[PDB]
Amino acid sequence: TNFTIAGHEEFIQTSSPKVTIDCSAFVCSNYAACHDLLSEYGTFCDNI
């Protein structure tokens, strides 16, 4: 017989923070022997 109007709310995720990782700073920071041994694995860091 009598009515009213009510409101709700919701949140749907759409985006995500973008992350960028490199091998020149995570595995071998600045050393040369590590880089020489890392290149032995081939293109293992080109896929990440």
Partner 1 sequence: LSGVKPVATVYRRIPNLPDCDIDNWLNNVSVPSPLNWERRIFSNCNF
Q: Which of 10, 22, 40, 46 binds partner 1 (CB under 8 A)?
A: 22
Contact 28, 35 (CB under 8 A): yes
Q: Does 21 bind partner 1 (CB under 8 A)?
A: no
CB of 6 to partner 1, least distance (A): 55
- The single-letter DSSP state of residue 44 is T
Q: How many residues at the interface with partner 1, by CB under 8 A?
A: 4
Tokens of 15: 């985006």
State the residues that interact with partner 1 by CB under 8 A. 22, 24-25, 30
